Design a protein around this nucleic acid. Structure first.
Ligand SMILES: [K+]
Ligand SMILES: [Mg+2]
Ligand SMILES: [Mg+2]
Ligand SMILES: [Mg+2]
Ligand SMILES: [Mg+2]
Ligand SMILES: [Mg+2]
Length: 91
RNA sequence: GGAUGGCGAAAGCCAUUUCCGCAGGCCCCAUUGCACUCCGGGGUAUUGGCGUUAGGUGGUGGUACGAGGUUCGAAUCCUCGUACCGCAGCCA
């Protein structure tokens, strides 16, 4: 089911944070406006990223487009998030 | 952190240190993991800096003391330098 936030995983853990977001914003920013991209390299967050678009139509489209797209030698696996990203909910 | 020395009852502050450790470098093991304050672990390198909230320059706000101005005089308001705390970046 739909969500303002796509969740990517199977991302190269080697890529540094700031360098990762750049590229992610570079790719997804074209499927529509992005409210933010969340990235952390914790023991449980690495490899995963939370892209937050501003309109569901963006996430959903970006989802069908990029699923499996090569990224630093690793097919991006994406799917909606499980829950409205903090900012979204409030709004 | 330790240990030793200095002023102290202490706290704290200074110092030395082929005791241990931290951030930067380089390799390594582990994790496929729905989060929104962060946060796995190890080896080697280790001059300098620092001490577990653990490196730095220049910059923004704060806190402190100092100086110049304001002022009859200021404890007010102004700007400035210095130390430190949280910020961002950048560099290690
Ligand atoms: K020493
Ligand atoms: Mg001691
Ligand atoms: Mg002593
Ligand atoms: Mg001491
Ligand atoms: Mg290191
Ligand atoms: Mg004065």
């Amino acid at each position: 089911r739909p969500n303002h936030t796509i969740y990517i995983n199977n991302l190269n853990e080697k890529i540094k944070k700031d360098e990762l977001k750049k590229s992610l914003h570079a790719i997804f920013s074209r499927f529509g406006q992005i409210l933010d991209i969340l990235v952390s390299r914790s023991l449980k967050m690495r490899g995963q990223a939370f892209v937050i678009f501003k309109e569901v139509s963006s996430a959903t489209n970006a989802l069908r487009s990029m699923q499996g797209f090569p990224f630093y030698d690793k097919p991006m696996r994406i799917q909606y998030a499980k829950t409205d990203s903090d900012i979204i909910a409030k709004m």
